[PDB]
């Protein structure tokens, strides 16, 4: 479980980088997301979309 | 670039140089020529000290202190 | 550009970040010869995008907070 754990990371990073939070919302409804098939890549994406929001809430209470 | 129409001690007391300064600061803040509102403030506070220590400056200042400028989101008068 | 004070909002920083990410991922590649779509290039270029984004968001929300303070003062005077 080394490659699939490692390749999900790269593929998710490319998803986060190559798409604004609005091209992603609609690419998820037209099946044209860069890696829609890969369950590991999209699960890592859903994890990192949790950490970004975690910071955006924690910091906007800290301020 | 402000010393082009704000140094000639007869070109200050004209009533358009106030409009020139207002348009300079505004179009600098909007069209990126003046990026940061922490930098338009330094331009204000240096152009006013150039125009205050100079013959012809009192009326330029009294004319510009009624023009509108928008910094830090809050709009106000100089 | 964040800590200098160009972006007044969060949406403008978001758009600026995204567009400059794309244009840099292209320009630096074509300067170094590497294919911009290369799989290994996009392994170290897009490496740790969430930590970079979090650092940027933090060092920009500091600016948003101080800008809100400044604007609230200059607005409670008008």
Curated annotation (Swiss-Prot), chain B:
<protein>
    <recommendedName>
        <fullName>Internal virion protein gp15</fullName>
    </recommendedName>
</protein>
<comment type="similarity">
    <text>Belongs to the T7virus internal virion protein gp15 family.</text>
</comment>
<comment type="subunit">
    <text>Homooctamer. Interacts with gp16; after ejection the gp15-gp16 complex composed of a gp15 octamer and a gp16 tetramer probably binds both the viral DNA and the host inner membrane. Interacts with gp14.</text>
</comment>
<comment type="function">
    <text>Component of the cylindrical core that assembles on the inner surface of the capsid during capsid formation and plays a role in viral DNA ejection into the host cell. The inner core is composed of stacked rings of gp14, gp15 and gp16 proteins. Following binding to the host cell surface, the internal core is disassembled and gp15 is ejected along with gp14 and gp16 into the infected cell. Gp15 probably remains associated with gp16.</text>
</comment>
From Swiss-Prot, chain C:
<protein>
    <recommendedName>
        <fullName>Internal virion protein gp15</fullName>
    </recommendedName>
</protein>
<comment type="similarity">
    <text>Belongs to the T7virus internal virion protein gp15 family.</text>
</comment>
<comment type="subunit">
    <text>Homooctamer. Interacts with gp16; after ejection the gp15-gp16 complex composed of a gp15 octamer and a gp16 tetramer probably binds both the viral DNA and the host inner membrane. Interacts with gp14.</text>
</comment>
<comment type="function">
    <text>Component of the cylindrical core that assembles on the inner surface of the capsid during capsid formation and plays a role in viral DNA ejection into the host cell. The inner core is composed of stacked rings of gp14, gp15 and gp16 proteins. Following binding to the host cell surface, the internal core is disassembled and gp15 is ejected along with gp14 and gp16 into the infected cell. Gp15 probably remains associated with gp16.</text>
</comment>
